[PDB]
Amino acid sequence: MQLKIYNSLTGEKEDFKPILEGNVGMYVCGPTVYSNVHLGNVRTFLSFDFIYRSLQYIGYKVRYVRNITDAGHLTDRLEKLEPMEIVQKYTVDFHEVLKKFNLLPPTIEPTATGHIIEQIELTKKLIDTGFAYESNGSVYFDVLEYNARGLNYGELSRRNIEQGEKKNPQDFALWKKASPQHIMRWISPWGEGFPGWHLECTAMSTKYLGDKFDIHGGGMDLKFPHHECEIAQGKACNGTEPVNYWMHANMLTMNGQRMSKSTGNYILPMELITGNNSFFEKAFHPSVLRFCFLQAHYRSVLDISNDAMLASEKGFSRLMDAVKLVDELQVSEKSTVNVQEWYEKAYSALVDDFNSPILISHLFEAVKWVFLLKDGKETITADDLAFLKEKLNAFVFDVLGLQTVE
């Protein structure tokens, strides 16, 4: 049956209907490469990797854009320190981490510094159209004028709760004047400055996907102000909503507690992989970690603990044992298991807002069958075996993105 996606705009699961048949344009907010990528951000990027893989298995042609914030968003020549040196250091580490977790590369991976010119044009566009105003070298988005025209700022997060350069405190910066402390700067119509965080993603998303595209993803912390500002920028620039489906991935906790460097309940991705940490009793292969992650729904809070990870590992091994045993299973003239029925149960879970936990459970029905088949307690024809092998590898390696561990 057809795919359903939870949409943060409406708070309900919706029939997914693409703007262009057989095609999906998809944008996910990427890392700010001024420090090491956090584990919770890895989960978000892994969740949208799974979603990207699933959209392709279903047969869509998916253009997946995921940006890199290498300029601005500071809220996050040999003797002079170089911002681009830092950017390079954490960009490389970011890609090494994601490669270990077997994430596919996105179709396009634009950088904010790669699109200053496009962002300066959008700022001009919003100034000339009345949605923005220059103030002491910066440019701010006029929230109250945006509202007076009826465009409803806050429709995503559904909130109205809670300096001198701005007409109103809720105005946000599209362009910021560079102070002498700012090394990264660019000439512009308003002096030397650097981009506002939110306008980077609007310039980059619409350039490669259009004024309106199917899916926009990110962590739930981006819902406000970031994604709220992307919506307002897109509606004020193009006169239409930029995104039909807004997807938000949920938090990650450890031992039921929030991940905090200040609390001490903190662990970097590599520390969890290598076991160089005091929360987990061993090292863990990233595919085991990925398996564990996918046992939680991307909109659920994922909690990692030593006992939960060990349980995921035991379940991971059983799955892969069956995967190896399929190539050696014997064949009978009749099948006492219904592979067609299992695949329909597995597939429906997948197109039910990418329900990886339920999908994994249906995979265990096939795992249980493989060990039963091996001991002659069940039988299977050659055609059903070929079908079982194709579907099970496709779910395990292509959709879930798991991989074998020697």
What six digits make up the tokens of 5? Answer: 């996606």
Task: Return the range that interacts with Cl ion (CB under 5 A); candidates 29-37, 74-82, 328-336, 398-406.
Answer: 29-37
Q: Which stretch binds Cl ion (CB under 5 A): 58-66, 123-131, 276-284, 293-301?
A: 293-301
Annotated binding residue at 226? Answer: yes
Q: Which does 34 bind (CB under 5 to 8 A by kind): Zn ion, Cl ion, a second copy, none?
A: none
Q: According to CB under 5 A, which residues from 142 to 201 bind Zn ion? A: 201
Do 32 and 264 touch, CB atoms closer than 8 A? no
Dist. CA 38–CA 44, nearest whole Å: 10
Shortest distance in whole angstroms from residue 406 CB to Cl ion: 25
Site map 16..35 versus Zn ion, x via CB under 5 A? -------------x------
Contact between 173 and Cl ion per CB under 5 A: yes
Binds a second copy by CB under 8 A, chosen from 82, 155, 192, 321: 82
What is the smallest separation between the CB atom of 51 and a second copy, expressed in angstroms? Answer: 17
Q: 193 has which bridge partners? A: 177, 186
**Sign of dihedral through CA atoms 180, 117, 139, 188?**
positive
State which of positions 58-77 bind a second copy (CB under 8 A).
61, 63, 77
Q: Which residue type, as a one-letter code, is found at position 177?
A: K
Smallest distance, Zn ion to C-beta of residue 88, A: 18
Beta partners for 28?
66, 217
Per-residue binding letters, 162-191, with a second copy (x by CB under 8 A): ------------------------xx----
Sign, Cα dihedral of 283, 288, 290, 291:
negative
Q: Which residues pair with 7 in a beta bridge?
A: 12
In angstroms, the Cα distances linking 76 to 62, 69, 120, 365 are: 30, 10, 22, 45
Give whole-number Cα distances, 90 to 184, 297, 337, in Å. Answer: 17, 28, 50
Instruction: Specify the DSSP class assigned to residue 396.
Output: I
Rg (CA), the chain: 24
Task: Out of 30, 40, 72, 110, name the contact with a second copy by CB under 8 A.
Answer: 110
User: Which lies closer to a second copy via its Cβ, residue 92 or residue 301?
Assistant: 92
Q: Known binder of ligand: residue 345?
A: no
Nearer to Cl ion among residue 57 and residue 371 (C-beta): 57
Q: How far is CA 254 from the centre of its chain?
A: 20
Number of H helices, E strands in the chain: 12, 14
According to the binding rule CB under 8 A, does residue 311 interact with a second copy? no
Judge whether 17 is annotated as a binding position: no
Task: Provide the minimum distance between the beta carbon of 334 and a second copy in the complex, in angstroms, as a whole number.
Answer: 42
Applying CB under 8 A, the residues found at the interface with a second copy are 19-20, 23, 25, 61, 63, 77-79, 82, 84-85, 88, 92, 95, 105-111, 113-114, 116-117, 121, 186-187, 207-210, 213
Applying CB under 5 A, the residues found at the interface with Cl ion are 29, 47, 69, 172-173, 293, 298
